Amino acid sequence: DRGVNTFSPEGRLFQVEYAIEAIKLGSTAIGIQTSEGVCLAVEKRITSPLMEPSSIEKIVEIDAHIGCAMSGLIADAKTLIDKARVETQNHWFTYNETMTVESVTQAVSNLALQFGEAMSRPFGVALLFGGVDEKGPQLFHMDPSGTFVQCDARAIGSASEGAQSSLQEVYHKSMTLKEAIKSSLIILKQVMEEKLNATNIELATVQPGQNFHMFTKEELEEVIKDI
């Protein structure tokens, strides 16, 4: 038996490795960034027809211009989402302006390694932040180890490898938001086990000049009609 804060012989913390292992059991989320906006698409795992699909929410609104998609252990993401919302409101209260996506990501990521023997173990949830600020549309990725990066197209979850492989050929810098939505839906259809039917998926976009928006049913069938 060993403590929570022991290094491995090749210089890695065991608990972070185990949490990263736990990440790979969640549903697949895919985010794409274009000069017209950012799009987030996530899978739903309906285990029974007696469940209500609308009670599963995996894309939340951090703020009117920032949205988040999560995977891994879902119950742990609530604390991070609450902290992010509180920090954005505090920033607005003090400075009378909107926080940027990078600052929100830093504020959330500073909580990752604050555990010991207060938290007793790492979080084991992976997040994608999509936002629009003075620099334009931006997509950020943050993982349980406390490291965050900026991306052009990212896929997290159990089928991340094949999804990233497909995104490598699909993506180009001149994509339109509509093409991005189509490509993300095609990749999601490829990686899922069930059939994509406008009920077991969730999709959202953030565009300049308008707030965070969640696609309803009718738009979902309209877009899926082409696929």
Partner: protein
């Protein structure tokens, strides 16, 4: 008993133009009926497009101006940008209210350029309440300087500002106020903030 405050005099003025701002003050430091110095300006450069002026109790002025600069550096390191004039005003309001039950005995004015390149002037009270104006005077001789600005800039009771006209108006109002206010006037310091940065100037007043 012990009194934690004294009054050290001083007058500050700000005028916002089409594409500039001007902040002016006097350089006399006094206490009671004595004169401490004749070379103590009251304008502090915050950023290459933002100036602040403080008057009142001197110790509070010094500590407040150090706190503001520390907070600006903290913000720049955390956010990778230089703070904006509106953000500076909104932060100063919270800083001032933090001491609600032992207030700062300071009068503050902020001048600079906004994000579209136009002049901005914000005025504060010792507790935190702030307001955006077009011109504002504070300190010992505010009551003497304000009606002149209302008459000449606002065109009150009568049947755009150039930079030169604003300069002449500022010099004239301080020359007139040096005649009648006890606490005001050894030299005049003027700071002009424009597209090219911040420029400074000095003028001589009465000495008695």
């Amino acid at each position: 008993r012990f009194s934690p405050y004294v009054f050290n005099g001083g007058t500050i003025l700000a005028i916002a133009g089409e594409d500039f701002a001007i902040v002016a003050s006097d350089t006399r430091l006094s206490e009671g009926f004595s004169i401490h110095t004749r070379d103590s300006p009251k304008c502090y450069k915050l950023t290459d497009k933002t100036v602040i002026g403080c008057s009142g109790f001197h110790g509070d002025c010094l500590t407040l101006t150090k706190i503001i600069e520390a907070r600006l550096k903290m913000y720049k390191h955390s956010n990778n940008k230089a703070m904006t004039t509106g953000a500076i005003a909104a932060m100063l309001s919270t800083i001032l209210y933090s001491r609600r039950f032992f207030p700062y005995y300071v009068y503050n004015i902020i001048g600079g350029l906004d994000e579209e390149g136009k002049g901005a002037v914000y005025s504060f009270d010792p507790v935190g309440s702030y307001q955006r104006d077009s011109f504002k005077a504070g300190g010992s001789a505010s009551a003497m300087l304000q009606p002149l600005l209302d008459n000449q800039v606002g065109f009150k009771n009568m049947q755009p500002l150039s930079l030169d006209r604003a300069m002449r108006l500022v010099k004239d109002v301080f020359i007139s106020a040096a005649e009648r206010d006890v606490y005001t006037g050894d030299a005049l310091r003027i700071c002009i903030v424009t597209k090219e940065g911040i420029r400074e100037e000095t003028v001589s007043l009465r000495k008695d």
